[PDB]
C-alpha cells in the first residue's frame, strides 16, 4: 500500500520539483523521447495484463499503466497537463491501495493463495465484497465522477496539445485500461461459487471503514476537482515554458 | 415547485433509496415505490412538454463548478431543449411502462430489489445524458449508461453466458468511449470550451479538416453505441439479460443515446459533407445487414434485436441526408414500437410452461392468447409502416427523402432503404406466423397450461399499443411541418431538401413501398401455409447461405478469431517473450548468469597450482612485464591498445 | 478586503536579491490570470448573444465569435520561465 | 397468495444514522456560513484562517 | 500442441506434462464434472496457455472453418460496395433545379462580408 | 485516574497457573470446567488500571501485568471462537474504533471543511474582482449608473480594451 | 421456485427474497424521507434556474457587438473569408 500509493507519486513529484525548473531548454528537445516511452509503457504494459495467472500482479501492472498516463501530462508543457497529472497522482493514491486491500486483505487473509483460477462467484456468499470489487473496478478505469477520470482526461488533453498524433494513440488507454480490469471483475463477481473456496466471513467493520474512506475521497475529487485548486494554481503556472 | 429540477431529482431518489433501504423496506414495497416515483416523473415531463408548445423558451438550471483551469470551464448545466424534451418524454414513457411491466414479470424472481434499483439508475443516467448542457455531462451519462448495461445484462451472476455477454457489451461501448474521449479532447482544444452554446456559435468559422477529425471521432463513438456494422454483435449478445431490461436497452434508451450524440452535434455536422456522407453509407449498410440476419435467425429475442438495428440504419440514413427532424421523429415513434414488440415477446415466452425461445417450437397460439396477439400485430403493422399507424409517418418519409435529396448518389440508397422495407416485412411475418397461425410444434401440456398474464403485464401493453397507434398523427405537426420552428437546429440552406422531397416524387416511387410492403407480407403468409416447401428445400447451397445469414453475417466469428483471439495471443507473446523473456535477460535473470560465469572465472584464476608461492611469484612477474608492454604499445597509438584490454578482460573474466 | 500588490518586472531588477524576483514572478503570473478573465468574459457574452439571438446569431455577433476565436491562441497561461530565462533583442 | 415475510429489521440501522447525520450536518453548516456571511461580510471559518502576510 | 503458439512454447517448458490443448466449451456438457460450469475434473492437468482454452476464453465457433468465414465475410462486404458503386452509374437525373435564395444568397445573413461572399454564400 | 490492586493481580496469576493452555481449554468439542473460564473472560474485559499508576510504578508490577493480560487475552478470544462467552449480542467496541471514529474521521471532515472554504480565496474570483476594479479605475463614470446597468457596462469596456498590462512588463522586447 | 437459502449472510439490498415484517411501518419513514428530500431540493434549486431567451436586453447585445467591432478594429484583424 505504501509503495503503490506513495512511492510512485513521489517520483511523479520529483519530475516536477527537480527537472522542469532548471532543465527547460533541455526538456523541450526531449519531450518526443518521453512520449515514445510513455505511450510504449501505456500500450505494452496494459496489454501484458491480459495474460496473468496471479491476482495482486494485475493491480500492479494497472499502477504502471496509470503512471504512464500520468507522466505525459507532466511533460506536456501545459497548464491542463500539470493539473491533470497532480489530480491523477492523488486520485490513484486513493483508489489503488483499496485495490491492494481487496486482493491482499479480504482475499489473502482468508484463503492464503493468490491464484486467479480458484476464485469464482464471490457474490453469492459475499455480496458487499462483490459490491466493493465492482465499484472499485469502475473507479480504476476512467469511469467519471471519481477523480481518476479527471486525471486521465486532463492528462490526455495536455498530451494532445504538445503532440496530437501521440495523443491519438494515447487516448486508446481508456479502452486498454478497461479490458483487463473488467475481465478480472466479472470472473471474481459472477459464476457459481467456487468448489475450491469454502465459505468464510463477510467483510469486517475495519475493512469496510478503510474502503468507505478511500472511496468517498475519490468521489469528492470526482464530483468537484476544484477543492484542491487553491494549492496548485501557482504551481500549474510555474513549470510552463512557452517563452 | 420546479419542473426542471424534479426531472433530475426524482429518479435519483428512486435509485438511492432501493439500495440504501432495500433490506429495510423489502421487495413488495420497493416495487411500488420505484414504480410510482417514475410514474410521477413521467407525468411531470408530459406536462412540461405541453408547456413548451406554448412558448419555445427552454429552462436551464445551473450548479457549482466542476473544473476551473485556464482557458476551460466545465459547469454542471441542465437544459431541456425541444430536442431534449423529445427524447425525454419517450424515455420516461418507456421507462415507467417497463417498471409497471416488470412488477408482474419478475414476481417469481428473487432479487428484484436490486433489479428495480438498476432499472431506475439506468433511467436516471439516461435523464442526465439527455438534459446535459455541455459535452461533459453528456460524457458522464454516456459512460454510466454503459456501466448500468454491465450491471443489467449480467443480472444473473450465476449464468456464465450472461457474464461474458455483459463483458462483450461493455467493451464494445468502451471502444466507442475511447473515441469520444479523443473527440472531446479535440473539442476542448479547438473551441476552448465544452458548452453547446459557444461551440455552435463559432462552428461555422473553424477549419474543415479539424471538423472532419472531430466528427469522425464522435461518429465512431455514436456508431459504437448505436450499433452499426463495425461492432454490431453486442445487441443480440445482450439477450442474456431479461425481457424488461432488453425492453429498456434496445427499444428506446441505450440505442437512442448514440443517435442523440449526432442529433446534438447536427449544428456542427452541417459544415462538413464528408462525415455526413460516411454516416449515410454506414446506416445504409446496416439496414440491409440487419434485415438479412433477421430473416434467417430463429430465436424471438434475437429477431427483435435485429429488427431494432435494421431501423438504426434508417435513422442514420436520415442523419446522412441532413434531415434531423425526420430522424428525431422516427426515434420517437420507434421506441413505442419496439417496447411493445419486446413486451409482447416476453408475454409469450412467459406464458409457455417451457419458457422456450425457439420460434420453431412455439406453434399455433392464436385462439389461446388473443390479447398478446392483438398487441403484437398492432406493433408489426406499425413496424412495416402500414398506413394510419405512426410507422407510416416515421418510416416512409425517410425513404421518400432518399430520392428527394439534391445529390445524385442518394438515389442508390433509396433502393437499399427500400430493400430493407421489404425485408422489414418478411421476418415480422415469420414472427407472426410460426407463433400464432401455424400448426402446433410444442407438446400438448403447454397448450393445456397456456393462459393470460397478470394485470401488471397487460396494462403497459395496452397503453403502449394506444401510443404506437396515435403518436405520429398527434406529434407530426411538431416534427414534420411545412415550416417548423420547434427543433432549434440549423440546416444549411442547401442541405435542406424537405420542400424538394415532397413534390418531386413521382406517383410510382411513393405508391411503391406502400403496395409492395402490403403484398410481400400477404405473400409470406400465404406461402407459409399452403405450400411450405419453397422455404423448406434441402439444396446444399442454400443451406450454406442460410447458415451464413443465421450466424450474424458471419461477423461474430470475424470479430472473435481475428481480433479477440489474435489480440489475446499477441498479449500472451508480450507477457512471456518480452515482459518475462527478454526484459529479464537485460534484467535480473541474465545479470545473475553473467556474474556467475565471471566470478567463477576470476575465482578459478588462482586455482591450478599446488603451491601458492610459485603461483603468486609467477603472477608478480606477468604484471610488471605485461603493464610495461602495454605502456610500450600505448604511447605510440591509443587505438591499438583498446582491443588488447578488451581481450585481457575477456580472458580474465572468461 | 481586496488587496492589490504592486507590479514589478523582470528587467529592471537584480536577480541576486530574491525579494524582487519573486514579486516579478508572481506579478507576471497574476497578469496572465487577469488577461484570462478578459477571455472568459467575452466567452460569457458570446453565449448570451447566441441564446438571445436564436437563428440570426451568424450576423448578430460575427464580431464576438471572431473576437473569441482570435483571443483563444494568445490568452492563456504562458509561464514566467520562458521570459525570465531568455532575453529578446540581445 | 401470501407474501411469506422474512423476520423484522429496524429502519434506522447504524450506517443510515451515521451517514445521514454527517451529511445533514455538513449541509446545515454550509447553510449556516452562507447565512453568517450576509450578516458580517465574511464566513465563520474564515475567522480561523490566520496565515502570515505575504510581505 | 495443436496451435502454433502452443508449439512456440514447447522448447521453454521443462518437467511439465505438455498435454493436448482442448477447448473447455467443446467438451460435451452431459458428462458429470466436479465443476459443471468449468467443465473440469478436480485434478486434471492444465494446458500450455490455459486461459485461451478456458470456459472464460473466447466463444470459438465451430460451424465454419475460420479461413472460409473470412472469405464469406469479405465476399458480402465487397459485393455490397461493388454493387452500390456500379449502381451510381445507372442513375437518373432529377427534374428540378436546386433552389435559389434572395439577398444575393443570404450572404449577410450567414455571417459574411462583401469580400467573403464566396465562402459564406448560397445559390442566388 | 483509577487504581489497581497488587494482591488481586498476584492471585489472578495464581489462578492462571493451574489452568490448561489456550490450545486445550476449549477444544472439547459443559459447566464443570467451562464455567470457571468465562469468569476469566470477564476478568479480561474489566480494566485493572488507569493512567496514574502506569507513570509512577515500577517494571516488575508491569511485567506481572503484561503476562496476566496476555493470558486473559487468549482465554477471552479462544473461547469466543469456539463458543461472558455463552451469549450473542451486538454492542461491542473493537480496539481501533476509539481513535478512528473520534479522531481520524473528524480530522478528515475538518480537512474537507477547510479545503471547501479555502477555495473561496482563489485566483479566479480575485482576478475577476481585480479586472472589474481596473475598469472602474480608468472609467469612473460607470459608477454613476444604477445597479443592473453597471455590470453590463463593465462588460462593454472589457470587450473594448484589453486592460492586461502584459506588454508593459515585457519592456525588453520593444 | 423458493429454494432454501442461508440466513447468515446480510446484504444491504436485502438478500434473496427480502420481506421484513414491518415493511408498512418502514414504508412510512421512506415516503417521509423521499417527499421531504424532493420538496427541499426542488425549492433549493429554484433561484439557480433561469429562462433561456430574454434574460438580458437586446440593446446590451448590440452594444457588445459594437465593442467587439472596436476591439477588432484596433488590432487590424481581417475577417475569415478575406484573403
Ligand atoms: C454533502 C456532503 C457529504 C460529504 C460526504 C460525507 C461522508 C460521510 C462520512 C460518514 O458519514 O461517516 C462514515 C465514515 C465511516 O464509514 P462507516 O459507515 O463507519 O463504515 C463502517 C461500517 O461499514 C458501517 O456499518 P455497516 O456494517 O452496516 O456497513 C454497511 C455498509 C454497506 O456496505 C456496502 O456495500 C457499501 C457499498 C459501497 C458504499 C461506499 C461508498 C459510499 C457511497 C457514497 C454515497 C454516494 C451517493 C450518490 C451521490 C449522492 C450525492 C449526495 O454501509 C454503507 O456504506 C452505507 C453507506 C450509504 C448510507 C447512506 C444513507 C444516507 C441516507 C441519506 C438520506 C437523506 C435524508 C434527507 C432528508 C431531508 C429532510 C429535510 O466515517 C467517517 O466519517 C469517514 C470520514 C469521511 C468524511 C468525508 C471525507 C472528507 C475528506 C475527503 C478527503 C478530502 C479530499 C481529498 C484531498 C486530497 C488531498 C488534497
Ligand atoms: C454517483 C456515484 C454513484 C456511486 C454509487 C454508490 C452506490 C452505493 C451502494 C451500492 C450497493 C449495491 C448493493 O448493495 O448491491 C449488493 C449486491 C447484492 O447481491 P444480491 O442481488 O442481493 O444477491 C446476493 C446473493 N447472495 O451485490 C452485487 O450483486 C453486485 C452488484 C452491485 C450493484 C452496485 C450498484 C451501484 C454501482 C455503481 C457504480 C459506480 C461506479 C463508480
Ligand atoms: C469508419 C471506420 C469504421 C471502422 C469499423 C470497423 C471496426 C472494427 C474494430 C472492432 C473492434 C471491436 C472492439 C475490440 C475489443 C472488444 C472486446 C470484446 O468485446 O471482447 C469480447 C470477449 C467476449 O466475447 P465472446 O467470448 O466471444 O462471446 C461472449 C458471448 N457469449 O471478451 C473477452 O473475452 C475478454 C478478453 C478479450 C478482450 C480483447 C483483448 C484484445 C483486445 C484487442 C483490441 C484491439 C483494438 C484495436 C483494433 C484494431 C482494429 C483494426
Ligand atoms: C445527487 C443528486 C444531485 C443533488 C443536487 C442538489 C442541488 C442542491 C443545490 C445546489 C447548490 C450549489 O451547489 O450552489 C453552488 C455552491 C456555491 O456556488 P455559487 O457561485 O453560489 O452558485 C453557482 C451558480 N452560478 C454559477 C450561477 C453562480 O457551491 C457548492 O455547493 C460546491 C460545494 C462542493 C463540495 C464538494 C462536493 C461534495 C460531494 C461529496 C459526495 C459524497
Ligand atoms: C436473398 C437471399 C435469401 C435466401 C436465404 C434463405 O435461406 O431463405 C430462407 C428463409 C428461411 O425461411 P424459414 O421460415 O425460416 O424456414 C426455415 C427452413 N430452412 C431452415 C430450411 C430455411 O426464407 C425466407 O424467408 C427468405 C425468402 C424471402 C426473401 C424475400 C423475397
From TrEMBL, chain A:
UniProt record similarity statement: Belongs to the complex I subunit 4 family.
Entry keyword set: Electron transport, Membrane, Mitochondrion, NAD, Oxidoreductase, Respiratory chain, Transmembrane, Transmembrane helix, Transport, Ubiquinone
Keyword Zinc: no
Organism of this sequence: Yarrowia lipolytica
Its membrane topology: Multi-pass membrane protein
Gene name, Swiss-Prot/TrEMBL: nad4
Whole-protein residues included: 244 to 486 of 486
The protein's name: NADH-ubiquinone oxidoreductase chain 4
Coiled-coil region: none
Enzyme class: translocase
Record's keyword annotation contains NAD: yes
Signal peptide range in chain numbering: none
Molecular function GO labels: NADH dehydrogenase (ubiquinone) activity; NADH dehydrogenase activity; ubiquinone binding
Principal location class: membrane
Automatic annotation (TrEMBL), chain B:
Entry superkingdom: Eukaryota
Enzyme Commission number, as recorded: 7.1.1.2
Domain NADH:quinone oxidoreductase/Mrp antiporter transmembrane: 134-419
Compartment list: Membrane
A single GO molecular function term of this UniProt record: NADH dehydrogenase (ubiquinone) activity
Ranges that cross the membrane: 5-22, 29-49, 82-101, 113-130, 136-157, 178-197, 203-224, 245-263, 275-296, 303-323, 335-353, 365-386, 412-434, 455-475, 511-535, 619-652
Family, similarity comment: Belongs to the complex I subunit 5 family.
Reported function: Core subunit of the mitochondrial membrane respiratory chain NADH dehydrogenase (Complex I) which catalyzes electron transfer from NADH through the respiratory chain, using ubiquinone as an electron acceptor. Essential for the catalytic activity and assembly of complex I. Core subunit of the mitochondrial membrane respiratory chain NADH dehydrogenase (Complex I) that is believed to belong to the minimal assembly required for catalysis. Complex I functions in the transfer of electrons from NADH to the respiratory chain. The immediate electron acceptor for the enzyme is believed to be ubiquinone.
Protein's recorded name: NADH-ubiquinone oxidoreductase chain 5
Organism per entry: Yarrowia lipolytica
TrEMBL record, chain D:
Domain of life: Eukaryota
Protein name: Uncharacterized protein
Residue span relative to the full protein: 25 to 79 of 139
TrEMBL record, chain F:
GO molecular function: oxidoreductase activity
Superkingdom of this protein's organism: Eukaryota
Keywords: Oxidoreductase
Record-listed E.C. numbers: 1.6.99.3
Protein name: NUWM protein
Residue range from the parent sequence: 48 to 242 of 249
Amino acid at each position: 500500500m505504501i509503495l503503490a500509493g506513495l512511492i510512485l507519486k513521489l517520483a511523479l513529484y520529483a519530475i516536477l520539483r527537480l527537472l522542469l525548473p532548471l532543465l527547460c531548454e533541455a526538456q523541450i528537445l526531449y519531450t518526443p523521447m518521453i512520449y515514445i516511452i510513455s505511450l510504449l509503457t501505456i500500450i505494452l504494459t496494459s496489454l501484458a495484463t491480459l495474460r496473468q495467472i496471479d491476482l495482486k500482479v494485475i493491480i500492479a501492472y494497472s499502477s504502471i499503466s496509470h503512471m504512464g498516463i500520468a507522466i505525459l501530462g507532466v511533460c506536456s508543457n501545459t497548464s491542463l497537463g500539470i493539473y491533470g497529472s497532480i489530480v491523477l497522482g492523488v486520485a490513484h493514491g486513493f483508489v489503488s491501495p483499496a485495490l491492494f486491500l481487496i486482493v491482499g486483505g479480504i482475499l489473502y487473509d482468508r484463503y492464503h493463495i493468490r491464484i486467479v483460477n480458484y476464485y469464482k462467484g464471490l457474490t453469492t456468499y459475499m455480496p458487499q465484497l462483490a459490491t466493493y470489487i465492482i465499484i472499485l473496478s469502475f473507479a480504476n478505469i476512467g469511469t467519471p465522477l471519481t477523480g481518476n477520470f479527471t486525471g486521465e482526461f486532463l492528462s490526455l488533453q495536455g498530451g494532445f496539445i504538445r503532440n496530437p498524433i501521440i495523443g491519438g494513440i494515447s487516448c486508446i488507454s481508456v479502452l486498454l485500461a478497461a479490458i483487463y480490469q473488467l475481465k478480472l471483475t466479472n470472473k471474481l463477481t459472477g459464476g457459481i461459487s467456487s468448489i475450491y473456496m469454502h465459505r468464510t466471513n463477510d467483510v469486517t467493520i475495519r475493512e469496510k471503514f478503510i474502503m468507505n474512506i478511500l472511496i468517498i475521497s475519490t468521489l469528492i475529487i470526482g464530483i468537484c476537482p476544484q477543492i484542491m485548486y487553491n494549492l496548485l494554481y501557482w504551481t500549474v503556472n510555474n513549470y510552463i515554458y512557452i517563452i | 415547485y420546479n419542473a426542471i429540477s424534479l426531472i433530475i431529482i426524482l429518479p435519483c431518489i428512486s435509485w438511492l433509496f432501493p439500495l440504501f433501504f432495500g433490506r429495510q423496506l423489502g421487495y413488495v414495497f420497493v416495487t411500488r415505490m420505484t414504480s410510482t416515483l417514475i410514474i410521477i416523473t413521467t407525468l411531470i415531463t408530459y406536462y412540461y412538454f405541453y408547456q413548451l408548445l406554448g412558448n419555445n423558451n427552454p429552462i436551464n438550471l445551473e450548479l457549482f463548478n466542476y473544473l476551473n483551469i485556464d482557458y476551460l470551464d466545465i459547469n454542471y448545466n441542465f437544459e431541456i431543449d425541444a430536442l431534449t424534451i423529445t427524447m425525454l418524454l419517450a424515455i420516461t414513457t418507456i421507462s415507467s411502462m417497463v417498471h409497471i411491466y416488470s412488477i408482474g414479470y419478475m414476481e417469481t424472481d428473487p432479487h428484484q430489489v436490486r433489479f428495480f434499483s438498476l432499472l431506475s439508475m439506468f433511467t436516471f443516467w439516461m435523464i442526465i445524458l439527455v438534459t446535459g448542457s455541455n459535452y461533459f455531462v453528456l460524457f458522464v451519462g454516456w459512460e454510466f449508461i454503459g456501466v448500468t448495461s454491465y450491471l443489467l445484462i449480467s443480472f444473473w451472476v450465476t449464468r456464465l453466458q450472461a457474464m461474458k455477454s455483459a463483458l462483450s457489451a461493455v467493451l464494445m461501448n468502451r471502444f466507442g468511449d475511447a473515441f469520444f474521449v479523443l473527440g472531446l479532447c479535440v473539442i476542448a482544444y479547438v473551441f476552448g470550451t465544452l458548452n453547446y452554446s459557444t461551440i455552435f456559435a463559432t462552428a461555422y468559422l473553424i477549419n474543415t479538416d479539424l471538423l472532419v477529425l472531430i466528427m469522425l471521432a464522435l461518429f465512431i463513438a455514436a456508431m459504437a453505441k448505436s450499433a452499426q456494422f463495425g461492432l454490431h454483435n453486442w445487441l443480440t449478445l445482450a439477450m442474456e439479460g431479461p425481457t424488461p431490461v432488453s425492453s429498456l436497452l434496445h427499444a428506446a434508451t441505450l440505442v437512442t443515446a448514440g443517435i442523440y450524440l449526432l442529433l446534438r452535434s447536427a449544428n456542427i455536422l452541417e459544415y462538413t459533407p464528408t462525415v455526413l456522407f460516411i454516416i449515410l453509407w454506414i446506416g445504409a449498410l446496416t439496414t440491409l445487414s440487419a434485415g438479412l440476419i433477421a430473416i434467417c435467425s430463429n430465436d424471438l429475442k434475437r429477431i427483435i434485436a435485429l429488427s431494432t438495428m435494421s431501423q438504426l440504419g434508417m435513422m442514420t440514413i436520415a442523419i446522412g441526408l441532413s434531415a434531423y427532424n425526420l430522424a428525431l421523429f422516427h426515434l420517437l415513434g420507434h421506441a413505442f414500437f419496439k417496447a411493445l414488440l419486446f413486451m409482447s415477446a416476453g408475454s409469450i415466452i412467459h406464458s409457455i410452461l417451457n419458457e422456450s425461445q425457439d420460434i420453431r417450437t412455439y406453434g399455433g397460439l392464436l385462439s389461446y392468447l388473443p390479447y398478446t396477439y392483438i398487441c403484437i400485430t398492432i406493433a408489426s403493422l406499425s413496424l412495416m409502416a402500414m398506413p394510419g399507424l405512426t410507422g407510416y409517418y416515421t418510416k416512409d418519409i425517410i425513404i421518400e427523402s432518399t430520392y428527394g435529396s439534391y445529390s445524385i448518389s442518394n438515389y442508390v440508397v433509396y433502393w437499399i432503404a427500400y430493400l430493407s422495407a421489404v425485408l422489414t416485412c418478411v421476418y415480422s411475418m415469420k414472427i407472426l406466423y410460426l407463433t400464432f397461425y401455424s400448426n402446433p410444434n410444442n407438446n400438448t401440456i403447454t397448450y393445456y397450461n397456456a393462459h393470460e398474464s397478470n394485470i401488471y403485464i397487460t396494462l403497459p401493453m395496452f397503453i403502449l399499443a394506444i401510443f404506437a397507434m396515435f403518436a405520429g398523427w398527434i406529434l407530426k405537426d411538431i416534427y414534420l411541418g411545412v415550416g417548423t420552428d420547434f427543433v432549434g437546429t440549423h440546416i444549411l440552406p442547401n442541405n435542406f431538401s424537405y420542400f424538394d422531397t415532397e413534390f418531386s416524387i413521382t406517383q410510382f416511387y411513393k405508391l411503391l413501398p406502400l403496395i409492395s410492403a402490403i403484398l410481400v407480407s400477404i405473400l409470406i403468409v400465404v406461402l407459409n401455409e399452403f405450400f411450405a416447401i419453397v422455404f423448406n428445400l434441402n439444396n446444399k447451397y442454400i443451406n450454406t447461405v442460410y447458415s451464413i445469414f443465421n450466424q450474424k453475417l458471419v461477423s461474430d466469428q470475424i470479430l472473435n478469431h481475428f481480433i479477440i483471439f489474435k489480440g489475446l495471443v499477441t498479449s500472451g507473446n508480450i507477457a512471456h517473450h518480452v515482459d518475462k523473456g527478454s526484459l529479464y535477460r537485460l534484467g535480473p535473470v541474465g545479470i545473475n548468469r553473467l556474474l556467475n560465469k565471471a566470478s567463477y572465472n576470476v575465482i578459478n584464476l588462482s586455482s591450478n597450482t599446488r603451491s601458492s608461492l610459485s603461483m603468486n611469484s609467477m603472477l608478480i612477474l606477468i604484471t610488471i612485464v605485461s603493464l610495461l608492454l602495454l605502456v610500450l604499445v600505448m604511447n605510440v597509438n591509443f587505438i591499438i591498445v583498446i582491443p588488447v584490454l578488451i581481450s585481457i578482460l575477456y580472458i580474465l573474466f572468461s | 478586503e481586496h488587496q492589490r500588490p504592486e507590479l514589478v518586472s523582470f528587467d529592471d531588477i537584480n536577480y541576486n536579491d530574491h525579494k524582487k524576483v519573486r514579486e516579478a514572478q508572481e506579478s507576471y503570473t497574476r497578469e496572465q490570470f487577469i488577461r484570462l478573465e478578459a477571455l472568459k468574459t467575452v466567452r460569457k457574452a458570446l453565449e448570451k448573444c447566441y441564446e438571445e439571438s436564436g437563428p440570426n446569431h451568424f450576423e448578430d455577433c460575427k464580431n464576438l465569435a471572431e473576437q473569441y476565436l482570435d483571443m483563444l491562441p494568445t490568452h492563456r497561461l504562458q509561464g514566467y520561465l520562458g521570459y525570465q530565462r531568455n532575453d529578446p533583442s540581445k | 397468495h401470501g407474501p411469506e415475510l422474512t423476520p423484522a429489521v429496524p429502519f434506522f440501522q447504524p450506517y443510515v444514522l451515521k451517514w445521514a447525520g454527517v451529511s445533514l450536518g455538513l449541509v446545515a453548516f454550509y447553510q449556516f456560513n452562507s447565512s453568517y456571511e450576509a450578516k458580517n461580510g465574511h464566513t465563520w471559518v474564515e475567522t480561523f484562517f490566520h496565515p502570515k502576510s505575504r510581505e | 500442441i495443436r496451435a502454433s503458439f502452443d508449439k512456440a512454447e514447447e522448447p521453454m517448458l521443462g518437467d511439465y506434462p505438455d498435454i493436448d490443448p482442448f477447448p473447455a466449451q467443446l467438451k460435451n456438457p452431459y458428462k458429470k464434472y466436479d465443476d459443471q460450469q468449468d467443465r473440469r475434473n478436480l485434478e486434471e492437468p492444465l494446458s500450455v496457455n490455459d486461459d485461451l482454452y478456458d470456459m472464460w476464453s473466447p466463444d470459438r465457433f465451430t460451424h465454419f472453418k475460420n479461413q472460409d468465414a473470412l472469405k464469406y465475410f469479405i465476399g458480402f462486404l465487397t459485393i455490397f460496395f461493388g454493387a452500390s458503386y456500379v449502381a451510381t452509374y445507372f442513375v437518373p437525373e432529377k427534374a428540378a433545379i436546386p433552389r435559389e435564395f434572395p439577398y444575393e444568397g443570404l450572404w449577410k445573413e450567414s455571417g459574411g462580408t462583401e469580400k467573403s461572399k464566396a465562402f459564406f454564400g448560397q445559390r442566388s | 485516574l483509577r487504581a489497581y490492586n497488587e494482591e488481586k493481580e498476584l492471585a489472578l496469576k495464581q489462578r492462571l497457573s493451574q489452568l490448561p493452555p489456550p490450545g486445550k481449554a476449549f477444544v472439547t468439542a459443559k459447566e464443570a470446567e467451562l464455567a470457571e473460564l468465562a469468569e476469566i473472560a470477564a476478568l479480561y474485559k474489566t480494566d485493572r488500571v488507569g493512567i496514574l499508576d502506569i507513570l509512577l510504578l515500577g517494571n516488575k508490577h508491569a511485567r506481572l501485568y503484561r503476562d496476566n493480560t496476555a493470558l486473559l487475552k487468549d482465554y477471552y478470544y479462544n473461547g469466543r471462537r469456539i463458543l461472558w462467552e455463552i451469549k450473542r449480542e451486538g454492542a461491542e467496541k473493537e480496539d481501533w474504533v476509539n481513535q478512528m471514529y473520534f479522531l481520524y474521521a473528524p480530522s478528515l471532515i475538518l480537512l474537507l471543511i477547510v479545503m471547501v472554504y479555502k477555495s473561496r480565496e482563489d485566483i479566479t474570483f480575485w482576478a475577476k474582482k481585480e479586472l472589474d476594479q481596473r475598469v472602474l479605475d480608468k472609467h469612473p463614470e460607470i459608477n454613476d449608473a444604477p445597479e443592473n446597468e453597471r455590470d453590463a457596462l463593465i462588460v462593454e469596456r472589457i470587450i473594448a480594451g484589453d486592460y492586461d498590462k502584459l506588454a508593459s512588463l515585457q519592456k525588453k522586447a520593444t | 421456485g423458493r429454494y432454501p437459502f442461508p440466513k447468515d449472510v446480510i446484504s444491504m439490498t436485502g438478500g434473496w427474497w427480502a420481506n421484513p415484517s414491518n415493511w408498512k411501518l418502514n414504508g412510512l419513514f421512506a415516503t417521509g424521507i423521499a417527499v421531504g428530500l424532493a420538496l427541499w431540493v426542488s425549492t433549493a434549486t429554484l433561484p439557480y434556474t433561469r429562462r433561456r431567451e430574454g434574460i438580458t436586453s437586446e440593446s446590451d447585445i448590440s452594444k457588445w457587438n459594437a465593442a467587439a467591432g472596436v476591439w477588432r478594429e484596433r488590432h487590424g484583424k481581417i475577417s475569415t473569408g478575406e484573403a
